[PDB]
Amino acid sequence: EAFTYLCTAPGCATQTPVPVRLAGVRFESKIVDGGCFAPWDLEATGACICEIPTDVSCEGLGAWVPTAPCARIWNGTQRACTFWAVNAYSSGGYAQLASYFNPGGSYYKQYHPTACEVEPAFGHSDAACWGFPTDTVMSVFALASYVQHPHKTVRVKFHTETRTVWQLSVAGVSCNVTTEHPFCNTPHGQLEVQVPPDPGDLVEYIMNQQSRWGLGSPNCHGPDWASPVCQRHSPDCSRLVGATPERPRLRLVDADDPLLRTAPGPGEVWVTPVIGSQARKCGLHIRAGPYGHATVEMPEWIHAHTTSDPWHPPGPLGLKFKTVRPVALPRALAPPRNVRVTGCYQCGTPALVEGLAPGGGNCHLTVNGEDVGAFPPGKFVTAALLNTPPPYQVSCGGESDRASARVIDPAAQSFTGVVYGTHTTAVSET
Ligand SMILES: *[C@@H]1O[C@H](CO)[C@@H](O)[C@H](O)[C@H]1NC(C)=O
Ligand SMILES: *[C@@H]1O[C@H](CO)[C@H](O)[C@H](O)[C@H]1NC(C)=O
Ligand code: NA
Structure with a gap:
């Protein structure tokens, strides 16, 4: 067993017992598209x-x-x-x-x-x-x-269940570590990466195409009070709500x-x-x-209240080198059958994913490449937060199949469960 600290800056690398290079820093999340915002x-x-x-x-x-x-x-x-x-x-x-x-x-x-x-x-x-x-x-x-004002209108995506992705190169082999998946395979063992906590929710301000980043909900009660998110909300970039x-x-x-x-x-x-x-x-x-x-000055507000990249803790990462090897479990590579996807994507409400997992072992289910968990052979039912729109290509790790879908977009979800506009009624003569 061995241990070393790996810094999180570009150029950071360790050499013993097995070389580990910090290739880059990215992030994973469950997107909640709020549509258009303006002051x-x-x-x-x-x-x-x-x-x-x-x-x-x-x-x-x-x-x-x-x-x-x-x-x-x-x-x-x-x-x-x-x-x-x-x-x-x-x-x-x-x-x-x-x-x-x-x-x-x-x-x-x-x-x-x-x-x-x-x-x-x-x-x-x-x-x-x-x-x-x-x-x-x-x-x-x-x-x-x-x-x-169109020059003051910004497209905003809220990032929930944020996971900092520490992109590593373990003796030439790519390994992307998160709080969810902190393990890497090494030539003759396993690497367990101790990672700092995730940064919480992020705010993605889309400029028109460039993305600017906010850290938080945002907080409308602090220095970011003038955020367009705290103001005019149009989910479909046409109709006003709230x-x-x-x-x-x-x-x-x-x-x-x-x-x-x-x-x-x-x-x-x-x-x-x-x-x-x-x-x-x-x-x-x-x-x-x-x-x-x-009065909000849009380019000026964005420049001072956002960053060019999402924030992440300074680190370092704790590299725990072990001689242990994971137990080889049987995997089903055949595509899943009778897959139905219902609900919405990029909305914040988990969509229902149901179908039949094939034989040969556990099905590591993907919906348009998105990991939704592993399922034993037979009937499966899961509630997954989807980031991709329909059609849905479903796979267990091998060949893909087309799923049946009844999935609406974030703008449609924002108008689901409501009757928009003027409520009209008539009072008749006696
Ligand atoms: C790590 O992420 C990069 C970029 O998305 C990808 O090209 C690579 O295949 C990933 N590595 C693994 C082991 O999933
Ligand atoms: C509108 O409201 C009046 C009472 O103010 C009546 O109840 C009328 O029937 C309503 N219209 C409808 C279609 O229900
Ligand atoms: Na007069």
């Missing part, structure tokens, strides 16, 4: 208008509201928009007098429909709108939503209002008319309180 980005636009527009929409307000921001914010999540009448028509017009601007603006909406809220704002300063010979007219439009901020709170705030001495809260948008340099024109100053009290 909650509160974006706002609008316009100060020296008119009472009759169509409160991006197209209807095209003469005042910036085109591209309006269209982008309108299509955003949890949209909020308000149209305020600061100074209405004194006479004439069409549903443009002050009387049409009752709280909630139902009278104006009757003739001028809009998806936006309509409110009176009489008493607010109309100083921004000037150059009217008679009848000063002014209105303010504000539009805000949570926009998903926790969502409320619709933004829009306020018309005059330039001299003492409220401006304080900062807006998260999800709050304050709009201030700016006096125009031109007659019958005005600008708009927008103050928005971002979700989580800060």
Whole structure:
């Protein structure tokens, strides 16, 4: 019997009693694909208008509201928009007098429909709108939503049941040691490798292709609080699920209002008319309180909060050299029969793998090359966490056979057991 320590850095090697070289460090895991993640980005636009527009929409307000921001914010999540009448028509017009601007603006909406809220704002300063010979007219439009920026969207895979893979070369023979499989064959004996514990769960941030690594769940209560994982979750990179901020709170705030001495809260948008340099024109100053009290800068966050490679303990590895040889057990090399795979892959819920193991010894069962355990001949049933999609090639170590599968992807699993969207009901007349 012999013992030596093997360091875990590139170039690390021992020579006695049998040479062992650290060839590399990799990792194995049970992947949980979360889909797409992005920060909650509160974006706002609008316009100060020296008119009472009759169509409160991006197209209807095209003469005042910036085109591209309006269209982008309108299509955003949890949209909020308000149209305020600061100074209405004194006479004439069409549903443009002050009387049409009752709280909630139902009278104006009757003739001028809009998806936006309509409110009176009489008493607010109309100083921004000037150059009217008679009848000063002014209105303010504000539009805000949570926009998903493609440059801030990251694909995230959670790595569970993580196993650091210490790739060794034992006298020229490849041996990959983990906490699950720490044994190696040596010329005339066995090597047992003492390994440090596994690092726990990992977070794989997929940049678009490059992978960046986080260590943990992540912890949304610590320095990684601003992680997109802690924010907007889209399992199929299309539909939103779970926790969502409320619709933004829009306020018309005059330039001299003492409220401006304080900062807006998260999800709050304050709009201030700016006096125009031109007659019958005005600008708009927008103050928005971002979700989580800060705006996430994606390349910068990833650079500081992730590593290029997954983390592993420093080692060293304990090399226990023994003269013992493992007992030769009979192995069945024929493929397994009537294999059925049911459930999901890369989801975190073990899939059901059932079939018939053939004769000749234990079947070292693989599902698309993934080890799912060894089974004695006859009927077998196992719950395995699968990382590969269907079709499933099943083997006992020799020839492979095609299994029957009813396996869904991680996005489909995220929508299984739920009915997505609006819940509609009707109350009939008596
Ligand atoms: C160890 O891992 C490498 C890379 O995946 C592979 O090429 C090699 O065959 C593995 N060795 C054994 C003994 O499984
Ligand atoms: C919707 O809800 C009302 C009560 O609020 C009735 O129960 C109606 O039958 C519901 N609709 C359906 C299809 O069940
Ligand atoms: Na007026």
